[PDB]
């Protein structure tokens, strides 16, 4: 019953493992626990500003996935839609394996494959993956200044690493999804996110560029995990040194937009999104997604074998995959406190959130550390679970 | 006793075959030979001198041998993708018995064609997922269509498995004949004439009848029909003349195929069979080197418990080499043979064998489509027993 959340965060700051941390836990749509620890940057020790801004990386994916579900509801496409219907550059895909064998794909990539990371795409930083070296040579993630549409043209020429539908591998497929959304609608994904999600939820600080007053609110990002170079064979030491993002994550590029990363947000903005996922509605009662399609989106859809869900061989114990991210399907296999049906996702800079329908609960932890050797997100979830009976 | 004569005469006396010729050679010279019956039961004309037979799939070892000669001469190789010579065979699809279609994951090669592992089917393959589409396209029925044009129609149809992954007796020897034409810029009938028939003095073998051939052509009997669907049970074995429609013209100067269509004689086919003991003409001219003949005869496709089957009929103890069947287990065989015996047969019940352990060749010529009696194997067994 003590405040384990503050204890976790203060200990991380006091041990020089994270510069600054913010968190909020809501229940029934209202804050029940919240706090902050540390500073905006350790170089000057400026205090965490009001409505501090974070690079949320793959916490972009549940947002872009939710947009796709809205467009499915509105009839733009369906889960079974072949993506080549919208961009013929994804016609005639090939599949490569670890033995240098290449053959034509025997199934078409669908919207559902993109949402479930079963399309056969890879990721630039996937260690040991048969094709990731070719992704890195193409600078798919590193070259943030390249237009989404043009990056997709380069990706489309590369082989998949399995036949669509047959395996699971966490991937660039959410970026493909953002692009296919643009093809299917004739609109830009950032404009669609603004009009259909951010504005109805009053997420005024969320987007692919900083707000006008955003520079002074941007949290510094730390860590040794590097985008420029080969995936490491052992984790870099966990040290608070400012991270060099190269040109991968611009702050003021009006055309920068992605599906798998790239949003800036705030704790308050992301909690508005997370709370919405408990119902599909805005706080006033506008429906962003009907209950039936929200249930379709949250139902466990990819189930895993004995070794479970893994990303670069890191486990997500007891989790299955739904159309928006992870979902807890076996508390008896879980590695940290949770409840059946808890869902959410996380980002490369150690941001983390969850939604727990059994407790009408949402939680989010914001920090900026790339390559963390400490699972701060899960530690904060566990603390909150222990505090909510 | 003359077991060969007893088998043949019994077949004639029981009204099962109209006329039968046979010859067995050892060391290039006849040791057994005979005939029984007539050219046609309607007029009871005797089997003529140098009687002519439609040899159907005994065309395949000849066209396969030609392909081996062209391999030896560097025209192509076993691993050559056929799409290099005819791009209509680029981007093949594969269909299955559950209506699923997907792109082929391997290219069809020359070796696939020679081994019936390319994924092609045959018009009369009962139960085969794609054979209905072959029949709708009249691939075998339409004998007047030029080989090149028939191949264009075939190339648009899906395979029934991915190239290299299974065995199914098929139209692939016709594809091989066509790819030979593409690779050489010559016609397959002209190549066969120059490279095989003329050196072996096979003056009566070809895709059309000789000028004096009409009176020598044996009548063909049987109820197995090319027209309709493959039958669910065999038609009665009765001596009624067969209607070939337009599938097997006698005087079309452009008719040529890889899997069927040759006319030949007993003497001509024995010249070919005897050559396969050495790769040489009787005079000693080399048609195929010993090394490539060995490559062609070595067992290349091995079969599971069900063994080699064509429309579910077994070839017990046989494996497949680049020219046809080859005996690989005498203890599995269903009739007398020796290890390494090889050869093939045709739809009108013609049959031949080469037995290297005995320096022996044999051929039985008759004309019956849809036979319910294995006359070829009965005659091989009789000949083996007379040694
Ligand atoms: C999967 C990972 C995440 O969001 O978890 C992700 C997605 C997209 C981009 C990036 C990066 O920019 C990056 C930065 C430093 C090192 C490696 C990658 C990381
Ligand atoms: C497979 C079979 C054979 O040579 O064994 C074959 C190959 C080619 C053509 C034909 C036919 O014309 C035919 C004639 C009557 C009935 C069915 C097919 C038969």
Locate the domains of chain A by residue range: 1-389
Ligand 2 pocket, B56 CB below 6 A? yes
For tokens 């005897």, what's the residue? B274
Among the listed residues B339, B189, B320, the one whose alpha carbon sits nearest the alpha carbon of residue B263: B189
Residue-wise over B197-226: b if at least 16 C-beta within 10 A, else e?
bebbebebbbbbbeeebeebbbbbbbbbbb
The DSSP result for B202-266, as a single string, is: -TT-BSS--TT-GGGBPP-B-S--SSSPPPSSPPP----B---TTSS-SS-TT---SSS--EE-H
Experimental method: X-ray
Instruction: Compute the radius of gyration of chain A from its Cα atoms.
Output: 20
Spacing of C-alpha A208 from chain mean position: 14
**Distance between CA atoms of A91 and A157, rounded to whole angstroms?**
10
Residues of B in contact with A106 (CB under 8 A): 102-103, 105
Centre of ligand 1 from the C-alpha of residue A260, in Å: 9
Kindly tell me the burial class for residue A253, based on how many C-beta atoms sit within 10 Å of its own C-beta (0-12, 13-18, 19 or more).
middle
Distance of alpha carbon B75 from alpha carbon B80, whole angstroms: 10
Chain A positions touching B100 (Cβ under 8 A) are none
Within 8 A by CB and 6+ apart from A127, the residues are A231, A232, A233, A312, A313
* Token pair of A209 as six digits: 């560029």
Number of Cβ within a 10 Å radius of residue B10: 13
CB within 8 Å: B106 and A104:
no
C-alpha distance from residue A238 to each of A11, A232, A369 (Å):
15, 14, 9
A109 neighbors A211 (Cβ within 8 angstroms) = no
Of the residues A92, A93, A103, A165, the best mutation for testing chain B's interface (the one with the most B CB atoms within 10 Å of its CB) is: A103
Would you mind telling me the total number of residues written for chain A in this entry? 389
Architecture of domain B1-387: 3-Layer(aba) Sandwich (3.40)
B83: exposed, middle or buried (C-beta count within 10 Å: 0-12, 13-18, 19+)? middle
Contact assignment for A107 to B102 by CB distance below 8 Å: yes
CA of A171, nearest ligand number: 1
At the second CATH level, the architecture of A1-389 is 3-Layer(aba) Sandwich (3.40)
Q: Closest approach of chain A CAs to the CA of B338, in angstroms?
A: 41
Nearest to A264 by CA among A211, A217, A208: A208
Give contacts of B102 with chain A, Cβ < 8 Å.
106-107
The closest of A351, A145, A161, A175 to A248, measured between CA atoms, is: A145
Classify residue B194 by its DSSP letter.
Answer: I
Q: Burial of A1 by CB count in 10 Å (0-12 exposed, 13-18 middle, 19+ buried)? A: exposed
CA nearest to B309, candidates B149, B126, B146, B178: B126
Instruction: Give yes or no for residue B4 CB within 6 A of ligand 2.
Output: no
How far apart are the CA of B177 and the centre of ligand 2, in A?
17
Q: How far is A156 from chain B (nearest CA, A)?
A: 18
Measured between alpha carbons, how far is B18 from B213 in angstroms, rounded to an integer?
A: 19
Contact flag B102-A106 (C-beta cutoff 8 Å): yes
Task: Scan residues 50-89 of A and list those with Cβ closer than 8 Å to B.
Answer: none
Please name the helix (run of DSSP H) or strand (run of DSSP E) that holds residue A37, with its range, or none: strand A30-38
Q: State both tokens at B200.
A: 């072996």
Rounded (to 5) percent helix, strand, coil in chain A:
30, 20, 50
Give dist(CA B75, CA A148) in Å, integer. Answer: 49
Nearest ligand, CA B369 = 2
Alpha carbon of B141 to ligand 2 centroid (Å): 9
For residue A91, give the 3-state DSSP assignment.
coil
Stretch (H or E) spanning B352: strand B351-355
Q: B105 CA to chain A: closest CA distance, Å?
A: 5
Token pair of A149, please?
């549409």
Angstrom distance (rounded) from CA B226 to CA B131: 12
* The token pair that represents B88 in the structure block: 């209509």
Residue A229 CA: distances (Å) to CA of A14, A160, A347: 31, 21, 20
Which residues are CB-neighbours of B326 under 8 A, at least 6 positions away?
B297, B299, B318, B319, B320, B340, B341, B342
Rounded Cα–Cα distance for residues B177 and B258 (Å):
5
What is the Cα–Cα distance from B374 to B316, expressed in whole angstroms?
13
Helix axes B266-275, B59-72, angle to 10 degrees: 40
Q: Are B63 and B282 in contact (CB under 8 A)?
A: no
Output the ligand 1 site: residues, CB below 6 A: A 57-58, 125, 141, 225-227, 248, 260-261, 347-348, 370
CB B259 within 8 A of CB B223: no
Cα–Cα distances in Å, from A354 out to A26, A63, A273, A281? 11, 13, 11, 17
Please list, in sequence order, all residues whose beta carbon lies within 8 angstroms of the beta carbon of residue A308, skipping any fewer than 6 positions away.
A315, A316, A317, A318, A319, A333
Please tell me if residue A103 touches chain B, with a CB cutoff of 8 Å: yes
- DSSP character for B335? S
Contacts of range A296-300, beta carbons closer than 8 Å, 24 or more positions apart: A296/A69, A296/A323, A297/A65, A297/A66, A297/A69, A297/A322, A297/A323, A297/A324, A298/A322, A298/A323, A298/A324, A298/A327, A298/A341, A298/A343, A300/A327, A300/A329
Distance (angstroms) between ligand 2 centre and the Cα of A279 equals 68
Q: How far apart are alpha carbons A52 and B376 in whole angstroms?
A: 91
Q: How far is CA B354 from CA A170, B339, B349, B362, B363, in A?
A: 60, 11, 17, 7, 9
Q: Which of B108, B103, B171, B243 has its CA nearest to residue A163? A: B103
Classify strands B360-365 and B351-355 as parallel, antiparallel or unpaired.
Answer: antiparallel
Residues of B in contact with A91 (CB under 8 A): none
Q: Which ligand is nearest to the CA of A325?
A: 1
DSSP letter, residue B368: B
Closest CA to A239 of A377, A47, A373: A373
**Is B102 in CB contact (< 8 Å) with chain A?**
yes
Closest of A144, A153, A138 to residue A254, by C-alpha:
A144
Measure B77 CA to ligand 2 centroid, in angstroms.
Answer: 29
CA angle (A348 as vertex; A347, A349 as ends), nearest 5 = 95
What six digits make up the tokens of B331? Answer: 């203890």
DSSP letters spanning A301-364: -B---TT-EEETTEEETTEEEETTEEEE--GGG-SSS--TT-EEEE-TTS-EEEEEGGGTEEEE
Which sign does the torsion angle of CA B110, B114, B120, B123 carry? Answer: positive
Q: What is the DSSP string of A151-215?
A: HHHHHHTSPBSS-TTS-----THHHHHHHHHHHHHSS-HHHHHIIIIITTTT-TT-BSS--TT-G
């Amino acid at each position: 019953m003590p405040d384990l959340l503050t204890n976790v965060a203060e200990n991380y700051v006091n041990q020089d493992l994270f510069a600054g941390i913010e968190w909020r836990i809501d229940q029934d749509g209202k804050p029940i626990f919240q706090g902050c620890a540390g500073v905006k940057d350790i170089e000057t020790r400026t205090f965490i500003p009001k409505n501090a801004i974070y690079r949320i990386y793959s916490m972009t994916k549940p947002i872009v996935s939710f947009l796709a579900m809205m467009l499915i509801e509105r009839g733009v496409f369906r889960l079974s839609s072949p993506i080549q219907n919208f961009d013929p550059r994804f016609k005639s895909m090939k599949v490569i394996d670890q033995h240098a064998h290449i053959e034509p794909a025997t199934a078409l990539i669908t919207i559902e494959h993109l949402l479930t990371h079963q399309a056969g795409f890879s990721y630039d930083f996937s260690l040991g993956c048969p094709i990731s070296a070719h992704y890195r040579d193409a600078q798919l993630i590193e070259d943030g200044g390249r237009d989404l549409t043009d990056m997709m043209g380069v990706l489309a020429e590369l082989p998949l690493v399995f036949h669509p539908g047959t395996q699971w591998k966490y991937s660039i497929s959410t970026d493909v999804l953002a692009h296919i959304i643009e093809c299917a609608t004739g609109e830009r994904v950032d404009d669609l996110l603004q009009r259909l999600i951010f504005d109805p939820l009053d997420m005024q600080d969320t987007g692919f560029s900083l707000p006008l007053d955003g520079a002074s609110r941007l949290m510094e990002v730390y860590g040794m995990r590097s985008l420029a170079g080969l995936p490491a064979l052992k984790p870099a030491p966990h040290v608070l040194v400012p991270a060099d993002l190269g040109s991968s994550h611009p702050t003021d590029d009006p055309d920068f937009r992605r599906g798998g990363h790239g949003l800036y947000s705030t704790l308050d903005d992301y909690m508005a999104f997370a709370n919405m996922l408990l119902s599909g509605q805005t706080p006033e009662g506008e429906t962003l997604l009907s209950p039936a399609v929200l249930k379709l989106a949250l139902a466990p859809r990819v189930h895993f074998g004995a070794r479970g869900m893994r990303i670069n061989d890191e486990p997500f114990a007891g989790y299955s995959w739904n159309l928006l991210g992870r979902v807890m399907t076996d508390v008896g296999a879980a590695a940290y406190a949770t409840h059946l049906g808890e869902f959410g996702w996380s980002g490369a800079a150690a941001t983390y959130f969850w939604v727990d329908p059994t407790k009408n609960m949402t939680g989010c932890v914001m920090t900026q550390f790339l390559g963390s050797q400490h699972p701060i997100g899960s530690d904060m979830q566990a603390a909150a679970m222990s505090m909510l009976g």
